[PDB]
Amino acid sequence: TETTSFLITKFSPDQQNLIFQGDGYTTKEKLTLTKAVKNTVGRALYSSPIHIWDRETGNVANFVTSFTFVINAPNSYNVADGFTFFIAPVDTKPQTGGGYLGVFNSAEYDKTTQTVAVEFDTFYNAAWDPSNRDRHIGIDVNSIKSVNTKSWKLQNGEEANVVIAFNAATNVLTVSLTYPN
Template sequence: TETTSFSITKFGPDQQNLIFQGDGYTTKERLTLTKAVRNTVGRALYSSPIHIWDSKTGNVANFVTSFTFVIDAPNSYNVADGFTFFIAPVDTKPQTGGGYLGVFNSKDYDKTSQTVAVEFDTFYNTAWDPSNGDRHIGIDVNSIKSINTKSWKLQNGKEANVVIAFNAATNVLTVSLTYPN
C-alpha cells in the first residue's frame, strides 16, 4: 500500500505545484479559475500524477481530499456555472466551458473519458441538470449528467469547507460541504 499526501496551504503568483490551464491563475493568495465573462474555462491541476488505480491488480485506492472555496459573485443570481473537483487521466485537456464546467464536451456518457467529477453547479442547464432547477452538488462519472445530486444553498461570498472521500471497499464516494459561519 502506498500513501500519497500533499497540502497546498496558500496560493501565490509563483505557484510551483500546480499546472494552470485556460484562464486559471493565482494571485494575492487566491486561486482564480475563470474570468468574469461568459463561457470561460480555467483549471488548476496538481503537478504530479497521483496513482489511484493499479492496472495489474485492478485495485482502486481509498482517497480523501479537503479544500475551502469562496464563490464571490457580483450578486447571488449571477454566479456563472460552477466548478468541479475532478479525477482524470494525466493528459486530459480542458474541455467545453459554460455548463460543461471545463471537464466534459457532451451530456452523453463517454466511457473513454475515464473521468469522475464532483460538481458544484450554480446554474440550471435544462439538458442535463435535475428537473427541480436547484443549485446542486453532483457526482459525475464520464458525463456532465450527474448520477447523484443534492440541492445546495450557495452562500455568496462565504467560505465553504468541502471533504470528498472515496471508500474502495464499498465503492462509495461521499461529499460534505459546510459553511462555518
C-alpha cells in the same frame, strides 16, 4: 504500498507544483480559476500523476481531499456555471466550457472521457440538470448529467469547506460542503 499527499494552506505567486490551464493562476495567496467575466474557463491540476488503482493486483486506492473555495457573483440571481474537483487521465486539456464545466463534452455517457467529477453547479441547464432548477452538488461519471445530486443553497462570497472521500472497500464516494453559518 504507494501513497501521495500534499497540503497548501496558502498559494504562492509561483506555485510550480501546479499546472495552470485557461484563466487559472495564483494571486494574493489564492488560486483563481475564473474572474467575474463571461464565457471563460480556468483549471488547475496537481503536477504529479497519482496511482489510483493497480493493474497487477486489482487494488484501488482510498483517498481524501479537502479544500476551501469561494464563489463571488455580482448578485445572487445571475450566477454561472460552477466549479468541480475532478479525476481524469494524466494529459488532459480543458473540455467544453459553459454548463459543461470544462470537464465533459455531452450529457450522454462517453466512456472515452474517463473522468469522474464532483460538481458544484450554480446554473440550471434545462437539457440535463435537475428539473427543480435548484443549484446543486453532483457526482458526475463520464457525463455532465449527474448520477446523483443534492440541492445546495449558495452563500455568495462565503467560504465553503469541502471534504471528498473515497472508500475503496465499498466504492463509495462521499462529498460534504459546510458553511460556517
